[PDB]
Write a protein that binds this ligand. Sequence first.
Ligand SMILES: O=S(=O)(O)c1cccc2cccc(Nc3ccccc3)c12
Ligand SMILES: O=S(=O)(O)c1cccc2cccc(Nc3ccccc3)c12
Ligand SMILES: COc1ccc2c(c1)/C(=C/c1cnc[nH]1)C(=O)N2
Length: 302
Amino acid sequence: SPEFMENFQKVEKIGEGTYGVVYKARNKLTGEVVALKKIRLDTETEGVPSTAIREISLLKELNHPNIVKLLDVIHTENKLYLVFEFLHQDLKKFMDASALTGIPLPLIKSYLFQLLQGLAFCHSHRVLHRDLKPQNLLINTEGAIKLADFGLARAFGVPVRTYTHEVVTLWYRAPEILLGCKYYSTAVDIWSLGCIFAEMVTRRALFPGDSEIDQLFRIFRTLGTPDEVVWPGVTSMPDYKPSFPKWARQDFSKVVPPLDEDGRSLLSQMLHYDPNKRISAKAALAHPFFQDVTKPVPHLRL
Ligand SMILES: O=S(=O)(O)c1cccc2cccc(Nc3ccccc3)c12
Ligand SMILES: O=S(=O)(O)c1cccc2cccc(Nc3ccccc3)c12
Ligand SMILES: COc1ccc2c(c1)/C(=C/c1cnc[nH]1)C(=O)N2
């Protein structure tokens, strides 16, 4: 039974994603709360490009406990509304609410483990998220965390220039992308997740840059400016410049003080410069850091 936008009551804005504001809404019929993503279509040059639709088809096929569920799609004139299951909060809001004490370690471990399961599934299904950030990681009352707001390799609808997409995205962007690499791999998601892991532990973003070059310099200042020994081929990457400052590597003992050797070991493998040495989602699940992983329920307040 087709739904119509007149069947949904706006409740409040709950997020700012790649396509603008995300609304919490209530289906006037069932009384069910949902999340709405609006996409403005620009049927100009030729209409909707098959290419973009292909990526979306793969996303549509995804079915996993750690990937937000799409409940319905609503088409209008030049618009597209996606009706999603509503989850309590996103990771950014949760961290902001827990910044005075920080997220308990078992929860950090549980969320990272679940995100790795979600990514392992995506990567084995030809799907990369590409824009991982705390804001698009959704947590529910039952302790689950889910991936949402996937980035497409190909632009789909009309772009939405927000701080989140133009700037925040940069903070979690893999160095090979910043250096203009030809074709990147699923490893770019592992980098993003590694940055998020660090952030959950320190309660502060690891590399908050405001431009690609500033982002790159912030990364070099902490992990050290990469070289051919550490990352074979780095000096020949499209945007690499011999004139980049040469910073020495800082110890994770200083970068993420609270973590023990198992945590640092995992983090180091996720933030490896060489995409070829960066741990895979599947391999990460077997890391000893998750030896005592459980399924705790969070302390959500609003
Ligand atoms: O294929 S649909 O079932 O609509 C669909 C289902 C779920 C998510 C979608 C995201 C973008 C475009 C779609 N299709 C689309 C294609 C052409 C014009 C407008 C929307 C999506
Ligand atoms: O919205 S997302 O949270 O990524 C999403 C979540 C769950 C299932 C999805 C299926 C198709 C397209 C999506 N996203 C999408 C990405 C780019 C443009 C249009 C739709 C899906
Ligand atoms: C950006 O894309 C999406 C897709 C489905 C979603 C949310 C966001 C979403 C966000 C959210 C933010 N704070 C509570 N819920 C939600 O509950 N379901």
